[PDB]
Every structure is written in structure tokens, then in C-alpha cells.
Amino acid sequence: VRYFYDTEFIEDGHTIELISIGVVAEDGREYYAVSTEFDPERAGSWVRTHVLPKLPPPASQLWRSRQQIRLDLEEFLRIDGTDSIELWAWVGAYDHVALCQLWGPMTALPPTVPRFTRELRQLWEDRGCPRMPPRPRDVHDALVDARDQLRRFRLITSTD
Amino acid sequence: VRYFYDTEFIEDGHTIELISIGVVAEDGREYYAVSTEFDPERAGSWVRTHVLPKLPPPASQLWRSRQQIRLDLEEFLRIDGTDSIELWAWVGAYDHVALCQLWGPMTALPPTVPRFTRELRQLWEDRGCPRMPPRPRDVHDALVDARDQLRRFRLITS
Ligand SMILES: [Mg+2]
Ligand SMILES: [Mg+2]
Ligand SMILES: [Mg+2]
Ligand SMILES: [Mg+2]
Ligand SMILES: [Mg+2]
Ligand SMILES: [Mg+2]
Structure with missing residues (x-):
């Protein structure tokens, strides 16, 4: 059914260069990847300060190609299954x-x-506008952000 | 406070090259402009068939530069005004x-x-999902598209 996600990226007014994506389903399933293909050199101060240091180490399995991330997502989102x-x-x-x-x-x-x-x-x-818990201090990590969105969705809809 | 908008564009998985934008205000004002800076030849065939033929004739003051549109929208959105x-x-x-x-x-x-x-x-x-009016015949004109959005909005919230 529902998936909560977040991306980090380098965005310059022309393109959006994908850094990472975090996706969390209602059933507990989690997916996270960092793109091997963005150029960290192009990053601004904000992305250099708050995004790049949070990334995994070089030989982490979380670094994937953009082709690999897509295939992974086609599977994680169960695109050929019967759920909307x-x-x-x-x-x-x-x-x-x-x-x-x-x-x-x-x-x-x-x-x-x-x-x-x-x-x-x-x-x-x-x-x-109900009161939400504070954002976590780990934020700007795509997975932590995606998870926190599911959390807030659950809270917001808790008498619907 | 509230603006309803739509754009037509050429998008290639990397960039979104703006063709046109229409914005309609809840108070009734309307804005529409077509960009003189998109390359018509870069258009995929869906855009060539459905979007390009609905554009105003070239001599129309509707044709504006990207910088003109930006300046038009700052004034049209009353971004210096009072309102949210x-x-x-x-x-x-x-x-x-x-x-x-x-x-x-x-x-x-x-x-x-x-x-x-x-x-x-x-x-x-x-x-x-309340019942909506059927589609305008002149859809993929961004102004038309934007006007219908306000129309739906008013319906939904009555
Ligand atoms: Mg998010
Ligand atoms: Mg984000
Ligand atoms: Mg984020
Ligand atoms: Mg549209
Ligand atoms: Mg210009
Ligand atoms: Mg449209």
C-alpha cells in the first residue's frame, strides 16, 4: 500500500543529481541506497555540511549504481503485485x-x-496542524527522514 | 492567498524545459505566458501533437523570455505583499x-x-472523489488546465 520516502540530492536550478534514497513501507520493510554516480565536488556548503558526512563508508553495500537502485526499487515497491x-x-x-x-x-x-x-x-x-514529536538529530539521512515521515503519518491519522 | 497553476514542458529524464505556464488566482486574476527559450525541435512527439499546436501565434505578446516570466510572476503572486x-x-x-x-x-x-x-x-x-466536470476540449493549454484546477477546487470545497 503506502511507502514513505525521502531523497538527498544536488540541485542547481537545472538538474537534480541523486545522492541517496530512503523508502519505508507500512509493513516494516526498509530500503536505503546511495548513488555511486553523483559528483561530491559539485555539492554546496549545505550538502557538504549536512548530507555528505552522514553517508556510509566506501565499501558499504549501500553504494549502488542508478540502474541498480531502479531494479531494487521495482522489486521493493512490488510493482507486479496486486496492491495499489x-x-x-x-x-x-x-x-x-x-x-x-x-x-x-x-x-x-x-x-x-x-x-x-x-x-x-x-x-x-x-x-x-497537530503537535509532532521533534525531528530526530540524525536527519538529512534519507532513511531516518523516510522513517520519521511514517512515524508522523501514524500520529497524524491516529483518529481518522 | 491561493493560486492554481499548470505548466507544459519538455522533460527528458534530466531537465524540464518550460514551454508555458498558466496561473489563476482564487480572486479571479489570470496569468499565461509561453517561453521564447525552449527548443521546439527537442520536443517528443506527444508534445508536438498535443502541446505545440495549441501555443499562441509567434507575434503574440504572450511569448515572453524566462526572465520576463519570472518578473511577471513576482508581481502576479504579490510576493511582496501582505498575504500568505x-x-x-x-x-x-x-x-x-x-x-x-x-x-x-x-x-x-x-x-x-x-x-x-x-x-x-x-x-x-x-x-x-466527488463528481467533476468532463475535460475541456482545449486541454494541455496550461491556462485552461489551471482554470479547471480552480473550478475543481471550488467544487471540492463547497
Ligand atoms: Mg520526505
Ligand atoms: Mg528530501
Ligand atoms: Mg532528507
Ligand atoms: Mg499538468
Ligand atoms: Mg530570459
Ligand atoms: Mg497542463
Whole structure:
């Protein structure tokens, strides 16, 4: 059903260079990968300070190619299964582009992955801006962020 | 406060080259411009068939530079005014990136422009999918598309 995700990336007004993606399903399943293919040299101060140091070591199994990340996601999202895929992110526009651009043009996205990401910030407001726990101090790690989104979704919808 | 928008574009898995944008305000004002800087030859065949033939004739003052559009939108969104700007689109992730990239990186976005666009399909599904008017015949005109969004929005919230 529902997957909560987050991406980190280098975004320059022209392209979104994927750094990492973290995806967490309602059932406990977790997926995380860092792209072997971005150029850390292009990163700004913010990404250098808050994103790059949080990444795993060089010989970690979490470093994958963009082709590998896509294949992994086709499997993790159970694209050929019978459940409807519902994607969720907090402030998700660039994240949705960065995710879908793993298959290239909007055209090439599996007919089974939705063409929009539901916006958890919009749900939060809708239900009367309820108090959320503090963001974790590990944030800017795509997996920690994705996990925290599932947490807030559970809290927000807890009397729906 | 509330703006409903849509863009047409050429997107290749790497860049989103803006063709056009229409923005309609809840108060009734409308904006529409077509970019003189996208390369029509780079268009995939779907865009060639559905989007390009609906563009105004070349001599139209509707044709504006990217910098003109950005300046038009700063004034049209009253980004220096008093009001909260709230942006709305229907499945508008790509639309949102295309709009922000008129300023540049997300770094360069004016402080009062929201960092996210609300997703009108999500609201529609949250309100239980109420019955909508049939499609405009002139769809994939961004202004048309944007006008319909406000129309749906008003329906959903009545
Ligand atoms: Mg993010
Ligand atoms: Mg998120
Ligand atoms: Mg993050
Ligand atoms: Mg559209
Ligand atoms: Mg210009
Ligand atoms: Mg449109």
C-alpha cells in the first residue's frame, strides 16, 4: 500500500543529481541506497555540511549504481503485485522528480508507480496542524527522514 | 492567498524545459505566458501533437523570455505583499520544479513563495472523489488546465 520516502540530492536550478534514497513501507520493510554516480565536488556548503558526512563508508553495500537502485526499487515497491502503490513524502516535489528520474522520462515510469506523491505536510495542516514529536538529530539521512515521515503519518491519522 | 497553476514542458529524464505556464488566482486574476527559450525541435512527439499546436501565434505578446516570466510572476503572486501565498496544482511535482527553476536553485526562490505545492488530487481523494466536470476540449493549454484546477477546487470545497 503506502511507502514513505525521502531523497538527498544536488540541485542547481537545472538538474537534480541523486545522492541517496530512503523508502519505508507500512509493513516494516526498509530500503536505503546511495548513488555511486553523483559528483561530491559539485555539492554546496549545505550538502557538504549536512548530507555528505552522514553517508556510509566506501565499501558499504549501500553504494549502488542508478540502474541498480531502479531494479531494487521495482522489486521493493512490488510493482507486479496486486496492491495499489501509494507514495508519501513530506514536501515531496523534488523528491518525486528525483525518484521518477531513476527510470528517465515520465514516460518510462512503470504503469504501476503513481504519477504523484502525496504530500504529508498538506495532510498535517489539513487535520489541524497537530503537535509532532521533534525531528530526530540524525536527519538529512534519507532513511531516518523516510522513517520519521511514517512515524508522523501514524500520529497524524491516529483518529481518522 | 491561493493560486492554481499548470505548466507544459519538455522533460527528458534530466531537465524540464518550460514551454508555458498558466496561473489563476482564487480572486479571479489570470496569468499565461509561453517561453521564447525552449527548443521546439527537442520536443517528443506527444508534445508536438498535443502541446505545440495549441501555443499562441509567434507575434503574440504572450511569448515572453524566462526572465520576463519570472518578473511577471513576482508581481502576479504579490510576493511582496501582505498575504500568505499558497500554491496548488493537480499532480504537480514536475510543475513545481518547473516553476521554482524560474528563479534557479531552491536557494534563489523568493522568501514568501511556498517550498511546496499542495496537491489537488490528494485533496479530491481526501474529500471522497466527488463528481467533476468532463475535460475541456482545449486541454494541455496550461491556462485552461489551471482554470479547471480552480473550478475543481471550488467544487471540492463547497
Ligand atoms: Mg528530501
Ligand atoms: Mg520526505
Ligand atoms: Mg532528507
Ligand atoms: Mg499538468
Ligand atoms: Mg530570459
Ligand atoms: Mg497542463
